[PDB]
Design a protein around this ligand. Structure first.
Ligand code: NAG
Lengths: 88, 140, 22, 49
């Protein structure tokens, strides 16, 4: 499946991520690509042999902007570093 | 027993993981840089006619290519790092060795050439954007 | 500005005064 | 129950003063499961037996 946080078990590599098609090219022997800090940035589709990038799903910290309990009980929430599309 | 120095040769891709523009330090058996080799755990066998290798404590890599060991049958300068069993190779009219094949040994023979023998060492291998090990430094 | 030049739970929070107000 | 309630629980008070208070972390939990294994083209001769 592509573009949905999913559990990915390309043979030999187990991870949770959003699997998207990628432009970087692996040499024929290479299976899973890796990036600085040693994380599994990309995997090669075993059956279709295409480079499928792996990205971790959305994470961040909610913060509550409150006028003050005395002034009001209405609140706002800033979901830090997330894209409005994935908030709900 | 004529001796020839091996300059920046015997480097083989350590593992399948692709790394792009990343310098990775790997501690693995390798032929130390600038090491003398006899010219007639692993060997950087190379041939400038050459046919097959007989290796046993047995396996005969006769060259379809009549590989035999249990036995398994498969399909200028030539470089053939052999390790225990992983065989790497390159054919060239710094060059790194792909993992040409891995097969599920005390002495080496040949039938129809320079040989060198690897040791445990640490090296810094510079992968380029297309994940090719362009250069390396022996750190000792 | 030219000369001087995502993770496992480590987020860099943004500076409150944008560099266009500084 | 509510966003304000969580801020009051973090500050351990029934009164919360004006500001921005970090209270939680939001994660997108995985939607489904996928397994990909190599094209198993290879087969061996039980058929010949
Ligand atoms: C034997 O052959 C038939 C078709 O010729 C096939 O349907 C069947 O599965 C085969 N069985 C084995 C054990 O090969």
């Amino acid at each position: 499946v592509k573009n949905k946080c999913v559990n990915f078990n390309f043979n030999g590599l187990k991870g949770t991520g959003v699997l998207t098609e990628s432009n970087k090219k692996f040499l024929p022997f290479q299976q899973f690509g890796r990036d600085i800090a040693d994380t599994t940035d990309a995997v090669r589709d075993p059956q279709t042999l295409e480079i499928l990038d792996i990205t971790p799903c959305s994470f961040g910290g909610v913060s509550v902007i409150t006028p003050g309990t005395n002034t009001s009980n209405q609140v706002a929430v800033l979901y830090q570093g997330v894209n409005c599309t994935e908030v709900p | 027993p004529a001796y020839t120095n091996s300059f920046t040769r015997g480097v083989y891709y350590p593992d399948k993981v692709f790394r792009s523009s990343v310098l990775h330090s790997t501690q693995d058996l390798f032929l130390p840089f600038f090491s003398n080799v006899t010219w007639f755990d692993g060997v950087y066998f190379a041939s400038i006619i050459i046919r097959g290798w007989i290796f046993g404590t047995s396996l005969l890599i006769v060259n379809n290519v009549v590989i035999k060991v249990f036995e398994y049958v498969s399909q200028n300068l030539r470089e053939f790092v052999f390790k225990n069993f992983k065989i790497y190779s390159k054919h060239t009219p710094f060059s790194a060795l792909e993992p040409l094949v891995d097969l599920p040994i005390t002495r080496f023979q040949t039938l129809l050439y320079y040989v060198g023998y690897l040791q445990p060492r640490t090296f810094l291998l510079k992968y380029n954007e297309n994940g090719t090990i362009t250069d390396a430094v022996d750190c000792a | 500005f030219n000369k001087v030049t995502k993770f496992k739970g480590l987020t860099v929070l943004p500076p409150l005064l944008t560099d266009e107000m500084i | 129950l509510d966003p304000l309630s969580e801020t009051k629980c973090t500050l351990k008070s029934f009164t919360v003063e004006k500001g921005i208070y970090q209270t939680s972390n939001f994660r997108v939990q995985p939607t489904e499961s996928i397994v990909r294994f190599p094209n198993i083209t290879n087969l061996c001769p039980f058929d010949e037996v």
